[PDB]
From a paper:
Furthermore, the cryo-electron microscopy (cryo-EM) structures of mkACE2 with RBD-[name] or RBD-F486L provided a molecular basis for the [name] and F486L mutations enhancing the binding forces in the interaction interface.
We finally obtained the 2.3-Å AmkACE2 crystal structure, 2.9-Å AmkACE2-RBD F486L complex cryo-EM structure, and 2.85-Å AmkACE2-RBD [name] complex cryo-EM structure. Although most of the residues in AmkACE2 that are involved in binding to RBD F486L and RBD [name] are the same, the number of van der Waals interactions between AmkACE2 and RBD F486L is much greater than that between AmkACE2 and RBD [name] (322 versus 157), suggesting a moderate conformational change caused by the [name] or F486L mutation in RBD. In addition, AmkACE2 formed 7 and 4 hydrogen bond interactions with RBD F486L and RBD [name], respectively. In contrast, two hydrogen bonds were the same in the AmkACE2-RBD [name] structure, except for AmkACE2 E37 interacting with Y505 and K31 with Q493, including Y41 with RBD T500 and Q42 with Q498. Moreover, AmkACE2 E30 was involved in forming the salt bridge with RBD K417 in both structures. In terms of the [name] mutation, RBD F453 formed a stronger hydrophobic interaction with the benzene ring of AmkACE2 Y34 than RBD Y453, which contained a hydrophilic side chain.
Residue numbers in the entry:
A (entry chain A): 19 to 613
B (entry chain B): 335 to 527
Amino acid sequence: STTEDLAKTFLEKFNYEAEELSYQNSLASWNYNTNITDENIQKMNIAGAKWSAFYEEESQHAKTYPLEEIQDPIIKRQLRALQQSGSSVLSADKRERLNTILNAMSTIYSTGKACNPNNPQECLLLEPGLDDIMENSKDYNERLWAWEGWRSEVGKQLRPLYEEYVALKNEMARANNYEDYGDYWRGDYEEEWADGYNYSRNQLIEDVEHTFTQIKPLYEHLHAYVRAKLMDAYPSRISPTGCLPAHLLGDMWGRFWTNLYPLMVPFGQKPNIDVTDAMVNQSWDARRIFKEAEKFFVSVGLPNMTEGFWQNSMLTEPGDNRKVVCHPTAWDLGKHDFRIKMCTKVTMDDFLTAHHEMGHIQYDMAYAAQPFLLRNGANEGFHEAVGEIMSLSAATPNHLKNIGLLPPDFSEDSETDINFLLKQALTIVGTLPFTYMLEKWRWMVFKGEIPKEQWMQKWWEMKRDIVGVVEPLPHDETYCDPAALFHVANDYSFIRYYTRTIYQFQFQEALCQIAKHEGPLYKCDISNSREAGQKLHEMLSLGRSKPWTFALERVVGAKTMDVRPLLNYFEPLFTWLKEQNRNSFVGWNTDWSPY
Amino acid sequence: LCPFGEVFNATRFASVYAWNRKRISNCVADYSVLYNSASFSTFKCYGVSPTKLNDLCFTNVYADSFVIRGDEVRQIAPGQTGKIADYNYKLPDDFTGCVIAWNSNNLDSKVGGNYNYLFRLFRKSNLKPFERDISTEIYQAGSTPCNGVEGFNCYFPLQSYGFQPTNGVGYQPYRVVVLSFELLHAPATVCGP
Ligand SMILES: *[C@@H]1O[C@H](CO)[C@@H](O[C@@H]2O[C@H](CO)[C@@H](O)[C@H](O)[C@H]2NC(C)=O)[C@H](O)[C@H]1NC(C)=O
Ligand SMILES: [Zn+2]
């Protein structure tokens, strides 16, 4: 008896026991989210602790079989997901200290508050009190004490705790035959044991740096248009050849530029398209919204919902004594049980959100025949990219005329297409230098290129050079400014938001050629096209049986990612930007500061 | 009359490894009532015609009964492979009979789970058709003896279903009755005209 038959008998026992035990954990969390009491949290934490103790006992069983004696690609992809271990290699005194540091950083963030200068009886939390100032105010001095006070009270308490977190995380990584903790995070994209479809951890650095240099001419013309329109809202405060201040970007951190739209509109007489009033006049309810989303997928070739979807979902607020958290989520409880929990209102924003959440359900129903360890997307960016393109076709004016929400005598306007394209660029294009700069700073600090006496010196050197954002006030070596973000203080990776945007426009550009679309890409509608639904279904039913380089070639015909479909979408906007910038300056210098 | 009312309307049904067998004789059966019942999801007869089929004096009839999942009903057929077909219940290549099944989700499911039905997961070999095996030994995978303990390469050779009323259609209970029309030299009192 070889060692391949011993590892095969082990997986036929693991599948039947892990499926029945993870279903009791998922069912005990549904009853808490729809009914918040004191007895529900007690039953939630009991069933959620049996799954964590069962899983770590079989992670030591899986390491009895060496990985170099198996010659099957199906078996080896399931063993490597069960042979991975984390903090178990440390001692008892080192593992106990690690969980004390992690829990102490999460309570300072969720309970910390910043008080108001010149009125010391007003202290405000982040979510109810400090997010409303940064997203709705137009005062220069009101946004300044809410930006400095969050970083001098909360960020200076995590500085002595974050240095000891780096040393303990670098000791766990070196005992697992890695070189540092940054190399540990990049192993999600690694592929092995393939002939021509291999991918390396060093190749990910080269792919990100190559695609970033091709979006730089587009970002410079958007940077110049915003700067010339912000000198009217804040006169005599921004230099005509320089960077942008960090506390005037419509956000606490500057992650999105969405809330700056009413200060810059190209055609101020042509209104926007809003169908929120024709639904009221035709007596639409919450069940009418989810029935229109189901007819969209049938016309492209995708199946219907099941019987238990309509009986077990919560599509409206109960209106009873129960307390329910209203957050739109799609649930895969297991054993072919699919539910959607959201609080629906008769608007246009809730019309488009129902198409996004139903796109997650269609992905989950495709790989249901895979083994239990291989039921996921190709990597950590594939799942959200499928849902984004489904909400992109339903907002086209050609589709809204076919469902009676627009009159038949509706004339297309060329001045309302510039208004639609500028608002898309403030969310998608404007967040891409932000994500590139965040992950590059953390990779160097786990390796040792940046000593601890030069942490804050290199943080503001890369803001001026890559993003073009200048600090309002100088800092020193007692601050920790990246630690004021949610993902840094809660130990999350940030590179998944960069690659998800690039995958989104590669699928959209390929499917509009199968549908024989004539014209520009922003008017594409894939409805009533059954040929484009058969192409997408071939990739959705694979799961994790194949590498992600194999699954990309089945749709777009290429192995690696590409940025040229993204530059073709904003091509009408790029011609209009260069005509407006004929009397301006493109670029910035890193010598001007507000202080 | 016939004991067909005691088979289809019994309150208790057996498991798939310890399945039941009943001999039915000395009665006349109305097979046309079963054909036009319009309640069974599957009705697939093999060897015999799907016609009226009443005036046929068969030798003997057996009624087998067990409960399985809804994704395993395709395995109750000649020339099929699977966990149920190899270790639990096997049909021969020359089979004359019919297979009747229907959903029983409203009778065999509880809030919290029902764990009274078992099936066999590991076995050394396969079995012949119409063979029943009941055992509670220890399945040894490798070469190290287990001596009645569950360690490495030692497993308990049984597994239980878990039935809830909120499961999907493939995981719901199904109640299966198999009728075999064996032919042999006999007076053949079971005709049912
Ligand atoms: C919401 O939760 C509460 C408590 O967690 C549930 O109240 C319990 O209901 C059961 C069944 O009716 C009773 O046996 C308990 O005595 C109740 N506990 C209390 C503290 O009152 C309530 O039923 C849940 N709501 C729904 C709709 O299931
Ligand atoms: Zn989503």
